[PDB]
């Protein structure tokens, strides 16, 4: 651990500075260092961890898609053979992406999930586990693709089961989990009807619970509800 000599509090402070400077690779390294101190994370710290790696892997995914599109075109009929370079560079980006996903999954497995006993923390980490297996599934083409997909499904499902038992239907973690599991169904599991059913049921159950909320909680919940509606509009 290159962060092993830095104070936990200093790592958290620098992660926040890195976020302000849009230095997300640095942000992720600082938060990895903080996790490796071994203490459980607060809600704010969990958010810093997730924001950091979301931005890093999000950029990798965008680049992988650009390169995969070029590679696909290169293998159409009538395309000029241009050598191994497009595949090689897509593979380079892919391997870096897989490395980031493995790093995040490693932090969750050693030992964030097993020490997370409150519903809000456990669901949050299990959602992340589903998310990073989902990103691995996006680039998987070989013997383990089915097992990677099932690993995503299993983590999301455990998170869903806890969230339905322990959190209200407007809870933003519960909503965000459902949003992403619905995308998993649509884009990864080839299950668009399940994706639509999940998004619609989540939206309607949340609508019926908004009356219990403060103005600030209402703002949080309806923002994610609009994302559910946005996806439903895309899919129907």
């Amino acid at each position: 651990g290159a962060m092993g000599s830095m104070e936990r509090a200093s790592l958290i402070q620098k992660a926040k500075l890195a976020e302000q400077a849009e230095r997300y690779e640095d942000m992720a390294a600082f938060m990895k260092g903080a996790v490796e101190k071994g203490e459980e994370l607060s809600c704010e710290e969990r958010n810093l961890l997730s924001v950091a790696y979301k931005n890093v892997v999000g950029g990798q995914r965008a680049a992988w898609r650009v390169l995969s599109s070029i590679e696909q075109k290169s293998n159409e009929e009538g395309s000029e053979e241009k050598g191994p370079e497009v595949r090689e560079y897509r593979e380079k980006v892919e391997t870096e992406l897989q490395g980031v996903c493995d790093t995040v999954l490693g932090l969750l497995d050693s030992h964030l999930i097993k020490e997370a006993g409150d519903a809000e923390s456990r669901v949050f980490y299990l959602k992340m586990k589903g998310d990073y297996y989902r990103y691995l599934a996006e680039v998987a083409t070989g013997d383990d693709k089915k097992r990677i997909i099932d690993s995503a499904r299993s983590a999301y499902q455990e998170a869903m089961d806890i969230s339905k038992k322990e959190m209200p239907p407007t809870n933003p973690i519960r909503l965000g989990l459902a949003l992403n599991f619905s995308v998993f169904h649509y884009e990864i599991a080839n299950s668009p009807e399940e994706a639509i059913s999940l998004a619609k049921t989540t939206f309607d159950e949340a609508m019926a619970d908004l009356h219990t909320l403060s103005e600030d909680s209402y703002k949080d919940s309806t923002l994610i509800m609009q994302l559910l509606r946005d996806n439903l509009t895309l899919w129907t």
Binding site: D131, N180, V183, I224, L227, D230, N231, L234
Partner: peptide
């Protein structure tokens, strides 16, 4: 590409 958080 659909929305995720």
């Amino acid at each position: 590409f659909p929305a995720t958080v």
